[PDB]
Each structure stands twice: as structure tokens, then as C-alpha cells.
């Protein structure tokens, strides 16, 4: 349809419209036309992708600002749906208005995702594909080439077929998605991942995911190059601040100070032999030290520093190099007493935790190593190594880490910790230390986001209390309110089980995940849901190795066995690829009525974008709550530091963490209104968190299922399933749950 | 393409249109 | 209220009964019908178990299937052990039916259920059948998953090609294979997998099978079929059947081969000249020259007379007229004759008795 706001325009690609989709956007257009932020709240139910789109889209071609538009994700594989709905939008309004409108939407990803190289693309891990390419485009086998023929190096002609056309050329006008993109690349022999870079600046709409945005070691030159008025969208950023401490925390190992003193001792072996055969090249960057430049004026456009940035661009110094690591030896020294330092402080016996300021005065006391040098020391390694002529950094990949590490802790004092371990494993014969520097503010990542871009629109399925959000990350909000869907019918039966048939009951602690009776009761759980239910369930745990554990004792005890016989058993693995082929399988077992389960983390990579809708999915099973680990020291000092400081209570966050993964599961089982599903959730302790549920998930919930038996739910269960088989009336749904563009003029007419 | 019919939403569409055909039997024939 | 909340339901009602087009039905039916015979089949949800209910609703659906449509013809599968067991041919018999049912009804069903294996089965009866009969297969499922030895994405391809209709009852749940099943192959509506709630609506949904399908605007098979009608014969002494080569004592005479055969209708068993009476093709008028729908008067305008017309049942005084009127003729009708003349009866008497 193509209804109109108060001034704007705006293309639907469907003839019918939710009146929670409509309500969406009228809130988004008054967040975007009045600035700020806002946090939005809608059903999973209904369509949230396709009406931002929609409305985005419009907004940007109709007002003079053309403002951009910036579409995050948490994962890869939901920058592909956004792009599939994103083609289907503009495919509709190509088609209504009678052309293609100039419009350029791409996605961003590793190269990892989008490397045709037919010898590189085959590797099990990022960096090395990230180590290949550089080597074959940085521009060192360019120039060499150049030089002499002769010269083996060798090059990637996707990368060279592209300085033959222009930026402007290297993608036909419209939406590209990943599968798209890449067929069209294959057949020209050209690099997704260079083609998107190099077009951030002409995109109207850039969709990536959340770590392009918070963490500084790939967002630098992704952010430089989208523009300061584009608009901001965080879809799906309940579990936003996860991703903003980890962009901020390193772990080291014994393993790695062992194998960072031989990259040292190798560096310094190359830096001798550079020394005797070619020692200009040292000079020269002697000389620049200086003067004053950095990375940035000595690195071209083409290469990349070995060193990822760690730290927000914002807090890096500007001043010239301090002098003490001014020369290569000098610099080496410098590193090789900080491992040094930093191997014998892992000999602790007990658990220690420690300021930033803390470990720095100690160095500083032990050893001679001052603040200011610190923080330099990865823009100095990427230098060193950028002079040396390095082909294979095999045996520097160590001090990556080692840098990483030394200019984070000389950066930033408030909202981190470093802790030390002598048992990264307590259930180990020999003990292993780590140690940990973590960030406890999840704000400090996300900062300069919310002080760069003006309007930002957080909206996710499951994204409750709103309250929380600005208060964990400081940000204020314009309007931040949860919509409730208007379905005719009840679509969803959520149900809280207590106890089992027994009456016995159930709980998901992981001190007691070894007993007969709990586990049992789980398992026949399992098992007569597995009975009843027609097409998929899905089964969520509180952690790997709670599933890992469960699933062995029922093995034993034969609950399995019964569970074959209705359906096929696919298992979430530690492997990502075998756990794909689990997904592909366990999609075509539904399609097919041969009836399948799955079992999965609660917090693992099946959650955190994986949606299973229709058929995949018409029963949740939520074995627990899945809270944390509360005995990890992480965790721990994070939760004193949100009560010190944002005065945010120990049990209300755990409570707050475990429920946003639990709804976060509940919702990916309704597509639309026509789709269908139980939730369950099997723990005593979920009787009382009905008030922390989403409000769209715990209006459905009724206050004779908040604390069920495995026989009372069974057959509500059959009773649901029978009524949502009937044929639903259309008049019933006419015009109070579906709106057709009739139906949306009246809503226009007697609201104003 | 496949992928795309997945990512619609099915229930915002047309609903299905039956196209049954219809016959009009005209009644007049010759005496026995 | 009450007696007005009875009164609003029936014409809530018969709002659905209002809308009757003449729509083109395939008169000429060829029905496979698949029973579920699994271990799914033995709970209690209908008394005494499913497959006594099942097959007791099967046999009385026989029974009105061949009274309606007595130039059709039935064959019955079941599901056994994984695998696809024939328990009736292709025949126009309808104690041969009742006979393989109630045989069935014995054994204890058990194994499991397999989708494949039946329709690729009813695929296979369904080919010597001519193209202007309407293949149809009327799946009666209980269990909630499906094992079967091969893709059945490519058997339901193949059924869609070789213009075959299914029909799905479900017991407990949607399944989502049946649901593509009954849509991919009925031109994508989807009003034909349908699943019970009580065993009252069961009988419903068997009773509503019987009636002929609406064709397909695309589907055009249109064709003359030879027919014939023979002469009832009277003999004093018994003579040979040529359909069972048993004595028995009168038969029909074929008019092209002379050939007697023991009853109606049949396929002659040497000309395959199909035999029927033309009783057998007035059975079927009523679906191509449906009577137009009764619709009540408002009390406002004034009645005609103070009884019915064609049972002299005077009509009730009480709120709401009791009384239907056909536009055709424009006779009010009480409202028990309105039943009996679209569901028993299928010409309205006023229309009849008015001269032209
Ligand atoms: S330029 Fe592109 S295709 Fe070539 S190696 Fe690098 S990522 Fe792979
Ligand atoms: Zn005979
Ligand atoms: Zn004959
Ligand atoms: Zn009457
Ligand atoms: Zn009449």
C-alpha cells in the first residue's frame, strides 16, 4: 500500500498493514523529526525489519536533508535478512513508481564472508584469510613487481581487475545482498570485500553488524567514512552491552608470554639482520619518529597496521613518540622487560584484582617502564614490523597481544580491572594462571556512538525494562515505550512449570544438575512434549555444559530412546559449521513431517539470531533460568561496580541477564499473526519473573499458568495446539488485528 | 530466491481467490 | 435475549447458506481413501479408541458416497508397519468396500505411519482411470510425524502432475508436509486439511466429502462418454452372469454386446461399455441446478397467507417472522420445509405448481 504521515510518503511492499506496525512507524517518524533517542519495543509477531525500512527509506528520498541511513545488527546472518527485506522494499517502489530511484544499499563483513580467492578462501580462521590478502594487496608485491618481473610474490586478480573501473562503477545501481553480491562478483572477477569498502561513502543505507560500531580495532575505518547526519538504527541491542565490554577486555595465558618472548627474541634477529645488509630502512623511520608523524601519516591508504587500534580513537595521544622506544633495540627492550614483567606476575597464589593505576606503579617500580611509552606501544610494533619487511608474521603474531594488552592498561583507569588467576580451570591437576583485564562500563564503548550520530532508534523484539538500558549505558531517550500486539486470537500459549508430574520440584541450579529425580523430571518433560508436538521443538539450557551433562544422564536412563521414536535428535555443537549442518538438518526434518528437536544454549550462537518460525518452531523449552556462572570473578567485579555506581542491585541484573535471554529465545517461534507456539518455561524459580517478561509475552501469560505441573501443561498443550488447527474467521480479523488501506484512513480520520 | 519467499510475511498478502468456473445449464429439448 | 441469541445464531447460520453459485462439479469421481492404522491410532481421545471410530465413520461414509455418487468409484488403503497395505480395488461396488472395512476393523493397528508409501500407492491406482474423471485421494491421518523411505517433496510433485487432489483429517494437530500436500495440490487453497475438534464435527467432516468437488477454471477435460442403458430382463429359468460367472436368475441386457450382468452400474464385462439407469445421472441434477437460497422476511411488510404452502403448517405468531420465501415464486415457507427442500427435496414446490 502507499499511505501517508503527516507530511511524508510512504511505500509499504504488502496490501495489508498490522496496526502495530503503523504505531511503529509514527513513532519513529516523531523520534527522527523531533532528534534524540529513542527505545522501541515491539512484538516479534509482527513485522519490525520491513516497516523500518519502509519508513527509513521514505524519509530519506522525500526530505531535502537525504539523510543516510546506518542498519546494525548482532550477527552476520541477520545483516542478510535485512538486506533480503531491504530488496524486497525497493523492488516495490520501483515497481509503484515507475523507476529505479538512484539507491545504493550494501552490507559490511569480514573478508572471511566474502573472500573468492579460490587458495584463500579456505582457511578455518579470519586472520590468516585477513594475513593472505594483505600480502597480496598491501602493495608490496605491487611494487615489487613493478621493480623486477621476476619476482614470485603473487596477487589476488580480484583485487587488481578493480583499479581498471572507477568506485562509482564497481556495483550496478540498487540493494545488494551477500548471496547477490557475491554472484555478481564471481562473474566479473572482483572483491566483495574491497568493492564494499570502498563504497561506504555512496551507500544510502550501510548495514553491519554491532562490532563495526564498538569495537575500535575494526570500526576506525568503517566509521570514518560514514557521514555524521546519517540515521542510526539498533535492531535487536538487548544484548548490547555485552558486545561493549568484550570490545574492551584481552585474557593472557601462560601459553601466550611463552610464545610472545620467542616473537621478541625473533624480532630482534631481524631487526640484526636488517641491520647489516640494509640499515637505511631503519633511519628512515628514525627520522619520521622525530619529527612527529604516527601511523597514519606513514602508512598508506592501501596497507593496514599490524596492530589493531585497541582503544577508542578519542584517547590516543597526539604528542610525538616518547623517545625511549624511538629506536628499534630500544623498543625491543622495552617489550621484552614488559613480557618479562608480566610472566612474573603470573606466579600468584591466589586470586587477585587490581586497578589499572595499580599494576602501573608496580611496573613502574620493578621494572622502569613509565605510563606515556606505554600507551604507544602498539603504534610503534605496527611501525616496526611495517619497516622490517615481515613477509610471513608467523612468529609476531604473539606480540599482538602483548601490545594490545600494554596500551589498553596505560589508556583507561576507571571501569576496569585486571584480574589474576592461578586456575583458569579449578577442576585441573596442574594449575593453569590467566590473567584477565575486563571492562566493567559498557558505556565507554558505546560514547562516542551516542555523541556522534543525533538520532538513534534502539528497537529489538525482547528489549525490556526500557529504564535499565539508559541507565546501564549513559544515554537519554525522547520516548521509550512497548507496544502490544492486537491479535484476534490468542496465537502464543507461554506457560511457567514448576514441578513435574510428581509434584516434585524443578530447578535448573547447577549444583543439583546431578540428580536423579530433577533429571528425570526434565526428561519426561521432554519427552511428552515431544509427543504432542506436530512439527519442531526447540530445547533451550542454561549453559553448555548443564546440556552436555543432562543429555549424557538421560542417555543412561533411556529417555532418549522414546524421544526417537517421534522425532530426530540434532545437538547444538562447539563446532559453528557442525551445528549449521544441525540447523539445515533439523529444518528439513520439519519441512518433511518426519518431526525434529533440537537442543541448544540458551546463551550460545542458535539464540542470538536464529529464528524458528512455521513449523520450525511450535513448542520453546526453556530447561531453567539461564543465569550466569555466578562464581566468576568477571562477573563479580562487574556487578560491584554497576551497584557502586549506577545503583543497580547484584540480583536485580542477574535476574535482568538471565530473563533477557530467556525471552530472547521465546521470541523467535512468531513470524506473523497466523504463526503459533507454546512457550514453556521449566523452573520453579520463573514463577515470580511474569512482571519481567516482555509486556507483550506477559499479557499472554495468565495467572493459572505461572506455576504449572508437566501434566497440566501437557493438556493445556493439546487443547491450544487442537484450537489453533481451525479455520480462522476473516471477520474476525478484518479490521482489528489486519488493516488494509480503508481501514488505515479511518484510524487516520478519528484520531486527529 | 528461495531465501526471499522465506523472509516475506504471508499473512499481510492477498488472501487466496478461488477461481472455480461456473455453468448455466439452458433447459429446452424436443418432445419424446 | 436468549430466544433472540437463537434466533441471531440461526442467521449467523445461514449468512453462510445465503452465498450458492452454480459452481461446475466433477460428477464423475475416481476416490482413493487412506486410513491411518499406527500406534498413533490407540489412544482413548475418541471412544473406544481411533480406529474403531474411524473405520465405523468410514463405512457409513461408503455407504452415502455410492448413494450420492453412483457413478463413482472408491478404493481403500491403509497404513501398516511403515508401509502402504491394499484392502480394496478400484471397483463400483460399495459392498465390496464395506466388506474389506469391516475386515479391517479386527486387527490391532499398529507400526508407523508413511505418507509416501500411501500416496505413491494411490498414484499407482489412480492410472487406469480416464481423463474426465476427478482423481481424488481423501487422506485420514492421526500421528504427528511422518517416516518415509524417499523425498516426499517429489512424490507430491508428481501428484500435483498427474492431477490428483488430496483431501487431509487430521486428529490432533496441523502437520506441516499434509498442509503443503493438501495446498500445492488444490491450486493453493488451503481449506483442505482440515482438523477435528469432537467427535460430532468428525461426522461433519465426513459427510461433507461426499459431495462432488468444484473443477478448475484451467483444468478443462471436457469430453462426451459413451454410456449405455439397459433393459431390465424377467427369465423363468437362472443363466450365467457374465461379471461372476454364477447362476443367478435376472439380469440386465447390454445393448451393445447382449451380454447380462448382475446389477448396476457397472462397466459391461466385454464391450467396457459403461451400464447405468437413468436414475443413476437424475442423482446428480441437484448439483448442477442448485436451489437458490431461502431468505427470511422482515416483519415489517405484510405476509401473504397464514399458513405454508406446501405443508399447511401455520406459522408461529411469538419477535422474528417465521417465515422463508423463495424469490423465484415469492411462496413463503415455514421454516421446517426449508430444510427438507434444499436437503432432501431439490425443487421448491411453489416453482413447480406456478404455470407459465
Ligand atoms: S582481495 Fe578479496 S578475494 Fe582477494 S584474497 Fe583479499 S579478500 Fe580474498
Ligand atoms: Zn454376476
Ligand atoms: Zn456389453
Ligand atoms: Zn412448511
Ligand atoms: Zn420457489
Known amino acids: ?752 | 530466491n528461495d531465501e526471499r519467499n522465506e523472509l516475506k510475511i504471508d499473512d499481510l498478502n492477498e488472501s487466496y481467490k478461488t477461481n472455480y468456473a461456473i455453468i448455466h445449464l439452458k433447459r429446452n429439448a424436443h418432445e419424446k | ?356
Open chain 3, 1 to 356: 435475549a436468549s430466544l433472540v441469541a437463537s434466533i441471531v445464531e440461526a442467521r449467523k447460520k445461514r449468512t453462510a447458506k445465503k452465498n450458492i453459485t452454480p459452481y461446475q462439479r466433477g460428477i464423475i469421481r475416481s476416490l482413493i481413501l487412506t486410513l491411518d492404522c499406527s500406534e498413533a491410532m490407540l489412544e482413548k481421545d475418541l471412544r473406544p479408541n481411533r480406529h474403531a471410530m474411524i473405520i465405523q465413520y468410514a463405512i457409513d461414509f461408503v455407504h452415502e458416497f455410492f448413494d450420492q455418487n453412483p457413478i463413482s468409484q472408491m478404493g481403500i488403503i491403509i497404513m501398516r508397519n511403515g508401509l502402504a497395505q491394499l484392502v480394496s480395488q478400484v471397483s463400483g461396488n460399495p459392498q465390496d468396500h464395506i466388506d474389506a472395512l469391516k475386515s479391517i476393523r479386527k486387527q490391532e493397528p499398529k507400526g508407523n505411519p508413511s505418507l509416501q508409501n500411501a500416496l505413491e500407492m494411490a498414484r499407482g491406482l489412480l492410472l487406469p482411470v480416464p481423463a474426465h474423471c476427478t482423481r481424488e485421494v481423501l487422506i485420514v491421518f492421526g500421528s504427528l510425524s511422518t517416516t518415509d523411505p524417499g523425498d516426499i517433496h517429489q512424490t507430491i510433485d508428481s501428484l500435483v502432475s498427474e492431477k490428483i487432489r488430496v483431501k487431509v483429517l487430521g486428529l490432533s494437530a496441523q502437520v506441516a508436509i499434509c498442509k503443503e500436500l493438501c495446498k500445492a495440490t488444490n491450486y493453493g487453497d488451503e481449506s483442505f486439511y482440515k482438523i477435528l475438534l469432537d467427535e460430532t464435527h468428525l461426522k461433519e467432516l465426513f459427510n461433507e466429502a461426499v459431495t462432488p468437488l468444484p473443477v478448475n477454471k484451467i483444468n478443462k477435460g471436457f469430453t462426451l462418454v459413451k454410456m449405455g442403458f439397459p433393459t431390465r430382463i424377467f427369465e423363468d429359468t437362472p443363466t450365467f452372469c457374465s461379471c461372476h460367472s454364477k447362476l443367478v436368475y435376472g439380469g440386465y441386457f447390454c445393448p451393445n454386446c447382449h451380454s447380462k450382468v448382475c446389477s448396476l452400474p457397472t462397466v459391461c464385462p466385454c464391450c467396457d461399455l459403461m451400464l447405468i439407469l437413468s436414475t443413476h445421472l437424475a442423482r446428480s441434477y441437484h448439483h448442477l441446478m442448485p436451489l437458490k437460497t431461502f431468505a427470511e422476511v422482515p416483519t415489517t411488510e405484510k405476509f401473504r397467507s397464514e399458513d405454508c404452502f406446501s405443508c399447511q403448517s401455520r406459522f408461529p405468531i411469538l419477535l422474528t417472522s417465521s417465515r422463508y420465501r423463495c424469490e423465484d415464486c415469492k411462496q413463503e415457507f415455514c421454516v421446517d420445509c426449508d430444510v427438507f427442500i434444499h436437503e432432501i427435496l431439490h425443487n421448491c414446490p411453489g416453482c413447480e405448481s406456478k404455470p407459465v
Open chain 1, 1 to 752: 500500500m502507499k499511505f501517508y504521515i503527516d507530511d511524508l510518503p510512504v511505500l509499504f511492499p504488502y496490501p495489508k498493514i498490522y496496526p502495530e506496525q503503523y504505531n511503529y512507524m509514527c513513532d519513529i517518524k516523531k523520534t527522527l523529526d523531533v532528534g534524540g533517542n529513542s527505545i522501541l519495543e515491539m512484538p516479534s509477531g509482527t513485522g519490525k525489519t520491513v516497516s523500518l525500512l519502509s519508513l527509513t527509506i521514505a524519509y530519506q528520498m522525500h526530505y531535502p536533508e537525504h539523510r543516510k541511513i546506518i542498519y546494525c545488527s548482532r550477527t552476520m546472518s541477520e545483516i542478510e535478512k535485512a538486506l533480503v527485506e531491504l530488496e524486497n522494499l525497493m523492488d516495490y517502489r520501483t515497481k509503484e513508481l515507475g523507476y529505479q530511484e538512484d539507491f545504493r544499499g550494501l552490507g559490511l563483513t569480514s573478508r572471511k564472508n566474502l573472500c573468492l580467492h579460490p587458495e584463500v578462501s579456505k582457511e578455518r580462521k579470519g586472520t590468516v584469510v585477513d594475513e593472505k590478502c594483505r600480502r597480496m594487496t598491501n602493495g608490496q608485491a605491487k611494487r615489487k613487481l613493478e621493480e623486477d618481473p621476476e619476482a614470485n610474490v603473487e596477487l589476488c586478480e580480484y583485487h587488481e581487475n578493480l583499479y581498471n573501473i572507477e568506485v562509482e562503477d564497481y556495483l550496478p545501481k540498487g540493494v545488494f545482498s551477500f548471496e547477490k553480491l557475491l554472484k555478481y562478483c564471481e562473474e566479473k572477477t572482483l572483491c566483495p570485500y574491497f568493492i564494499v569498502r570502498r563504497m561506504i561513502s555512496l551507500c544510502n543505507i550501510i548495514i553491519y553488524s554491532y562490532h563495526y560500531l564498538l569495537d575500535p580495532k575494526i570500526a576506525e575505518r568503517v566509521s570514518n567514512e560514514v557521514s555524521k547526519d546519517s540515521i542510526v538504527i539498533f535492531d535487536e541491542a538487548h544484548n548490547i552491552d555485552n558486545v561493549c565490554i568484550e570490545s574492551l577486555s584481552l585474557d593472557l595465558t601462560t601459553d601466550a608470554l611463552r610464545r610472545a618472548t620467542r616473537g621478541a627474541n625473533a624480532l630482534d634477529e631481524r631487526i640484526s639482520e636488517v641491520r647489516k645488509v640494509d640499515s637505511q630502512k631503519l633511519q628512515d623511520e628514525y627520522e619520521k619518529l622525530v619529527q612527529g608523524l604516527h601511523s597514519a601519516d606513514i602508512l598508506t591508504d592501501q596497507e593496514e597496521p599490524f596492530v589493531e587500534t585497541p582503544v577508542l580513537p578519542q584517547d590516543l595521544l597526539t604528542e610525538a613518540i616518547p623517545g625511549n622506544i624511538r629506536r628499534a633495540e630500544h623498543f625491543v627492550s622495552f617489550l621484552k622487560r614488559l613480557i618479562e614483567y608480566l610472566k612474573t606476575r603470573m606466579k600468584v597464589l591466589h586470586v587477585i584484582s587490581e586497578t589499572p593505576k595499580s599494576f602501573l606503579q608496580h611496573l613502574k617500580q620493578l621494572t622502569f617502564i613509565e605510563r606515556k611509552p606505554l600507551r604507544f606501544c602498539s603504534e610503534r610494533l605496527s611501525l616496526l614490523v611495517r619497516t622490517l619487511e615481515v613477509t610471513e608474521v608467523e612468529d609476531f603474531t604473539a606480540l599482538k597481544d602483548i601490545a594490545t594488552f600494554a596500551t589498553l592498561i596505560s589508556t583507561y583507569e576507571e571501569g576496569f580491572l585486571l584480574i589474576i588467576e592461578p586456575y583458569e580451570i579449578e577442576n585441573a591437576a596442574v594449575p593453569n594462571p590467566i590473567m584477565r583485564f575486563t571492562c566493567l562500563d559498557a558505556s565507554i564503548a558505546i560514547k562516542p556512538v551516542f555523541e556522534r550520530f543525533s538520532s538513534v532508534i534502539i528497537t529489538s523484539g525482547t528489549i525490556s525494562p526500557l529504564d535499565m538500558y539508559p541507565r546501564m549505558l549513559n544515554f537519554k531517550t525522547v520516548l521509550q515505550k512497548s507496544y502490544a500486539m492486537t491479535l484476534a486470537k490468542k496465537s502464543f500459549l507461554p506457560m511457567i512449570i514448576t514441578k513435574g508430574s510428581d509434584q516434585v520440584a524443578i530447578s535448573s541450579r547447577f549444583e543439583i544438575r546431578n540428580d536423579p529425580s530433577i533429571v528425570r523430571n526434565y526428561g519426561s518433560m521432554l519427552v511428552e512434549f515431544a509427543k504432542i508436538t506436530p512439527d519442531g521443538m526447540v530445547v533451550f539450557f542454561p549453559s553448555y555444559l548443564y546440556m552436555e551433562s543432562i543429555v549424557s544422564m538421560w542417555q543412561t536412563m533411556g529417555i532418549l530412546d522414546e524421544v526417537w521414536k517421534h522425532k530426530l535428535i540434532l545437538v547444538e555443537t562447539p563446532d559453528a559449521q557442525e551445528t549449521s549442518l544441525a540447523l539445515e538438518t533439523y529444518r528439513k526434518a520439519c519441512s518433511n513431517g518426519r518431526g525434529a528437536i533440537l537442543l541448544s544454549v540458551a546463551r550460545g550462537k542458535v539464540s542470538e539470531g536464529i529464528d524458528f518460525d512455521h513449523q520450525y518452531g511450535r513448542t520453546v523449552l526453556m530447561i531453567g533460568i539461564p543465569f550466569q556462572y555466578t562464581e566468576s570473578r568477571i562477573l563479580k567485579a562487574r556487578l560491584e561496580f554497576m551497584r557502586e555506581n549506577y545503583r543497580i542491585r547484584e540480583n536485580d541484573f542477574l535476574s535482568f541477564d538471565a530473563m533477557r535471554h530467556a525471552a530472547q529465545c521465546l521470541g523467535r517461534v512468531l513470524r506473523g499473526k497466523d504463526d503459533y507456539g507454546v512457550m514453556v518455561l521449566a523452573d520453579r524459580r520463573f514463577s515470580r519473573k511474569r512482571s519481567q517478561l516482555p509486556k507483550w509475552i506477559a499479557q499472554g501469560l495468565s495467572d493459572a499458568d505461572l506455576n504449572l505441573s508437566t501434566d497440566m501443561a501437557i493438556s493445556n498443550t493439546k487443547q491450544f495446539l487442537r484450537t489453533m488447527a481451525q479455520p480462522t474467521d476473516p471477520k474476525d480479523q478484518e479490521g482489528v488485528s489486519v488493516w488494509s488501506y480503508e481501514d488505515l484512513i479511518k484510524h487516520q480520520n478519528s484520531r486527529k
